[PDB]
Design a protein around this ligand. Structure first.
Ligand SMILES: [Mg+2]
Ligand SMILES: [Mg+2]
Ligand SMILES: [Mg+2]
Ligand SMILES: [Mg+2]
Ligand SMILES: [Mg+2]
Ligand SMILES: [Mg+2]
Ligand SMILES: [Zn+2]
Lengths: 153, 341, 79, 179, 127
RNA sequence: UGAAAUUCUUGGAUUUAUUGAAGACUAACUACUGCGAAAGCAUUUGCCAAGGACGUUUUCAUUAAUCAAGAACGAAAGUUAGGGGAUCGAAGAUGAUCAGAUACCGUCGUAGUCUUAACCAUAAACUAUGCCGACUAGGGAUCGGGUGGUGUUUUUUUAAUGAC
RNA sequence: GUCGACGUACUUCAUAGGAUCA
RNA sequence: UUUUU
């Protein structure tokens, strides 16, 4: 049947689609500049925050996260990277100091302890079905004052 | 006037009357208030919308502080109980509260609550005429029993905000610090009455402060005690004595409902699909997809602003992607899972 | 979930020859009957040589990338 | 108004948009310009002809062909319609390799710099210079007034040669104020 | 009753030529350039210059007897840009408006299979 | 050129057509895809040798991994001695030196760019990421080979191949 | 010779971040 | 300030 042709086209579009994400994904992969990646990360955190994609943490979830942080103490300046930057005067620079402070604030977050949404469907179905013109338009009247796709058109 | 009617859906883009436009003309009210009554059919909210519409149509039955203390605030405390962010529900509280007042004590109630006697009586009269026209034209004798209504549910109160926003889609104002934090620096010491807002579709000036609009002294928000809502509905703008524009608030509206209502109006546009962790354009087929978009609200000579991203279902129609329906966070997550399985 | 000690027959059939539980050849031997003399000759499935029938000196198979292609008209059985 | 014809071959990647926009393409051609429009599916070329009995403006045919050509290069329909509306719009076309022989990632970054993040840089040039720019891979087309396309070209070329977008953006504000 | 010539349009960066010749190309009928129709050398590449040049040749060709021309538009080509400029586009439009019948339009820009080096240098050109 | 001027030009410039000569380079196809130890490699055809992967119920049987010493190759530029010398072009000269988005522009152009026989041995020679071996998730795209189908198409006699 | 390169010994500049309050 | 189906 000719329905088989329809199947091939649908696959062809899906294949052409997958390539496009691959090409774009390949190119974004190569760019690894800090400023570029920093801008993308910031914009992503806004979108997730604004859309509240992330679920609220229960009190038990926070306690477990706090427990691991106390168990490990992974976000203090005793880590290998933090100790390396501090002891060698590389944190006097502003940028590497920001990363150290970013790490430290993130650690601090985990350490913290008469009587007097349902989106409205304004479609035509939710309607006050009230019941009450051409001649009145005659009263107004008395007042006065694909073609060409394959063939020549 | 044509533009306002078009935003309400009264007129189409070619300035002919729509079916809604004909439908509103049957009522004795302004086009804004009709639209409130038009959408009220859901979940028996009609009695509340009629009361709100009658109150606004007739004028405020409240006596202001300037025109006149503990007694005044005491009466105000009683009628603001329905919602802490709505002037409209303060009006609804009084009008429906009167219904349970027996006729003999009505005069004592109006004086006891600093309420203008004449206006409420016309509000009563105009409520009957509205309920009469709707019952007569929907299928008629209306008694005072018919106006007696119980408290709205929490679900209803959110809906009333949406119906109210339907008629005042063009009078939404956003806190200025959200758009221009540099120019509108809000501190915890700042009085609520001095927090700047920016109306939608406001004509941009070289100095943005010229467009600022502040809360009216009479609004309950001045006594709110916390930061005001992100977006606000206002009825009209008044020039205060200090050359400061003051806005008569109606009620607060959240971002996602606001996009929902403006979707049917000309006041919403959709950005390109978002990309990143969580936000991924799920492709069912070459013609339909699920994705997150950033709705832009407002009409580039005016003040429009972007709303929170909302998951949408898009379909490719004649080469262009058209948003069919909105999707909850759970609905999108399950969708992302389904294609993985 | 699967049991490594007792793999499914189809599962092993899908795997590479060296990657099964006990590696073994996937090739085999054939009895090819010459069209003329009707004698039987043993031919390797993946024969790399143009096997010739000794009596008639007729080509029975031709080498290729993998399995040898048997000459047209030659009957064969798996031995 | 003699009988004349124009043929404009449609490249394959522009055929599908031509389909979805055909409803809005033949009305202005057949109504305002009084042209006989047709697409030869066998050759996949848009055919326009002058009707001697009906067509009156001698420049309608060439005006229509440029309008089809502008859509063919990748310009949106409404921008292409500007060619029918006006008579003083021209299309400037040049390649990246003409400015500078860029290859590999250097060519990819040059295209990215011209477009800018979310296309902001391209829109910045378009608004300031009152022109429309189509960035087809390494092929750049600019549409607008003659004096305007040259201004946009210089801003584009500075980006190709390596000038950062930020500095080019400030230059756009200056010329925009002068305009 | 219908005589054909060939209208060669050479659209460079700093000028536009409109040259009308017989079918062979040996015999020149009328050559007019943007410079001959403008006072300032800046505007020689301007579309307005081309329109005047196109109109002048169109008038001259009608006097000779030529009533239709095949357009062979070209750019500088070679190691430089390959697409005709607005000066060439303007010249084509003016020729159509002139009433002179346009037979066939083709681009004959010299395109190299692969060419010598470009004058810019490693850092580019056209600041 | 932002406008000019050095420049060519009634002994015919620029442009047009028919040819001819020289030296380079292989557009579009072109894709982080393919090949090579790396540097690198893109017109057709032939010759010479080399190579990974795959298939093998072929053969040897520890012959292997990493590697101071030592050796082969090593972009571009550059040096020695011939050849060539179209384009572009360090150096050098020269016009103009007015105007800040177009602010370094123009013209002539030596060495070079190309090649043969030797030197030099440096790169952001980059995945800013040693080599060998083992193990630890799913998905579908692509390149080379192999297996399986009673799948489509072609072979327009079949077929068998080839392509999907 | 207030000379160049190297070796050696020193000096110096880049530290604040979050919360509350006025 | 007025005022309206
Ligand atoms: Mg290949
Ligand atoms: Mg081997
Ligand atoms: Mg060596
Ligand atoms: Mg030499
Ligand atoms: Mg390299
Ligand atoms: Mg390994
Ligand atoms: Zn035999």
């Amino acid at each position: 049947p000719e329905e088989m042709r329809k199947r091939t086209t649908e696959m062809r579009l899906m294949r052409e689609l997958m390539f496009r994400e691959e090409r774009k994904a390949r190119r974004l992969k190569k760019i690894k500049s800090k400023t570029y990646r920093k801008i993308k990360k910031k914009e992503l955190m806004k979108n997730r925050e604004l859309a509240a994609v992330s679920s609220d943490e229960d009190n038990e979830d926070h306690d477990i996260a706090r427990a691991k942080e106390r168990m490990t103490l992974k976000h203090k300046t005793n880590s290998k990277w933090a100790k390396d930057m501090i002891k060698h005067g590389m944190t006097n620079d502003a940028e590497t100091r920001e990363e150290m402070e970013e790490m430290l604030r993130q650690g601090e977050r985990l350490k913290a302890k008469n009587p007097w949404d349902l989106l409205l469907t304004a479609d035509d179905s939710t309607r006050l079905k009230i019941v009450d013109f051409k001649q009145q338009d005659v009263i107004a009247e008395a007042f006065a004052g694909l073609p060409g796709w394959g063939e020549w058109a | 006037a044509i533009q306002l009617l078009q935003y309400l859906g009264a007129l189409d883009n070619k300035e002919m009357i729509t079916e809604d436009g004909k439908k509103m003309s049957l009522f004795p009210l302004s086009p804004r208030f009709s639209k409130m009554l038009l959408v009220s059919d859901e979940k028996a909210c009609l009695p509340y919308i009629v009361a709100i519409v009658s109150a606004l149509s007739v004028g405020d039955p409240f006596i202001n502080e300037f025109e006149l203390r503990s007694k005044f605030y005491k009466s105000r405390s009683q009628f603001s109980k329905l919602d802490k962010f709505s002037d409209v529900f303060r009006l609804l509280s009084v009008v429906s509260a009167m219904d349970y007042v027996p006729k003999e004590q009505k005069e004592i109630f109006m004086k006891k609550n600093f309420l203008r006697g004449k206006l409420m009586e016309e509000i009563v009269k105009l409520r009957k005429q509205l309920m009469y026209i709707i019952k007569s034209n929907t299928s008629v004798v209306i008694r005072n029993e018919d106006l007696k209504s119980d408290i709205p549910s929490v679900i209803q109160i959110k809906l009333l905000k949406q119906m109210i926003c339907a008629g005042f889609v063009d009078h939404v104002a956003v806190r200025a610090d959200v758009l221009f934090p540099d120019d509108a620096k809000i501190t915890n010491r700042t009085s609520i009455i001095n927090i700047p807002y920016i109306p939608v579709l406001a004509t941009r000036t070289p100095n943005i402060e010229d467009c600022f609009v502040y809360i009216h002294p009479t609004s309950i928000l001045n006594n709110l005690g916390e930061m005001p809502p992100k977006y606000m509905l206002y009825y009209s703008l008044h020039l205060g004595g200090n050359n400061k524009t003051r806005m008569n608030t109606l009620c607060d509206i959240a971002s996602t409902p606001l996009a929902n209502i403006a979707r049917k109006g000309l006041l919403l546009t959709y950005s390109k699909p978002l990309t990143g962790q969580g936000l991924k354009t799920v492709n069912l087929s070459p013609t339909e997809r699920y994705c997150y978009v950033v709705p832009r609200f407002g009409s580039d000579l005016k003040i429009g602003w972007d709303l929170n991203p909302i998951a949408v279902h898009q379909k490719k129609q004649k080469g262009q992607w058209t948003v069919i329906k909105f999707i909850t966070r759970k609905g999108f997550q399950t969708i992302t899972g389904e294609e993985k399985e | 979930v699967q049991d490594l000690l007792h793999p499914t027959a189809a599962s092993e059939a899908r795997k590479h020859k060296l990657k099964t539980l006990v590696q073994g050849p996937r090739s085999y031997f054939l009895d090819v009957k010459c069209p003329g003399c009707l004698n039987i000759t043993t031919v390797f499935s993946h024969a790399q040589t143009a096997v010739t029938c000794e009596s008639c000196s007729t080509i029975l198979c031709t080498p290729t990338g993998g399995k040898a292609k048997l000459s047209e008209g030659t009957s064969f059985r798996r031995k | 108004i003699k009988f004349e014809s124009r043929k404009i071959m449609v490249p394959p990647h522009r055929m599908t948009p031509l389909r979805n926009s055909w409803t809005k393409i033949y009305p202005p051609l057949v109504e305002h310009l009084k042209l006989q429009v047709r697409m030869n599916l066998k050759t996949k070329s848009v055919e326009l002809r002058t009707n001697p009995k009906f067509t009156t403006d001698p420049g309608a045919l060439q005006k229509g062909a440029d309008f089809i050509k502008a859509f063919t290069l990748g310009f949106d329909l409404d921008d292409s319609i500007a060619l029918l509306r006006l008579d003083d719009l021209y299309i400037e076309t040049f390649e990246v390799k003409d400015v500078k022989t860029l290859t590999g990632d250097h060519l990819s970054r040059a295209i990215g710099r011209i477009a800018g993040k979310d296309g902001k840089t391209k829109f910045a040039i378009e608004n300031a210079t009152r022109t429309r720019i189509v960035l087809a891979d390494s092929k750049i087309h600019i549409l607008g007034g003659f004096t305007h396309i040259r201004m946009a070209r210089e801003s584009v070329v500075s980006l190709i040669l390596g000038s950062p977008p930020g500095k080019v953006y400030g230059n756009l504000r200056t010329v925009a104020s002068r305009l | 009753s219908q005589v054909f010539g060939v209208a060669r349009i050479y659209a460079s960066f700093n000028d536009t030529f409109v040259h009308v010749t017989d079918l062979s190309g040996k015999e020149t009928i009328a050559r007019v350039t943007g410079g001959m129709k403008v006072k300032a050398d800046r505007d020689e590449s301007s579309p307005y210059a081309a329109m005047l040049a196109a109109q002048d040749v169109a008038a001259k060709c009608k006097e000779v007897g030529i009533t239709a021309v095949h357009v062979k538009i070209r750019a500088t080509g070679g190691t430089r840009t390959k697409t005709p400029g607005p000066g060439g586009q303007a010249a084509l439009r003016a020729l159509a408006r002139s009433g002179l019948r346009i037979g066939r339009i083709e681009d004959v820009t010299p395109v190299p299979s692969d060419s010598t080096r470009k004058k810019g240098g490693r850092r580019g050109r056209r600041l």
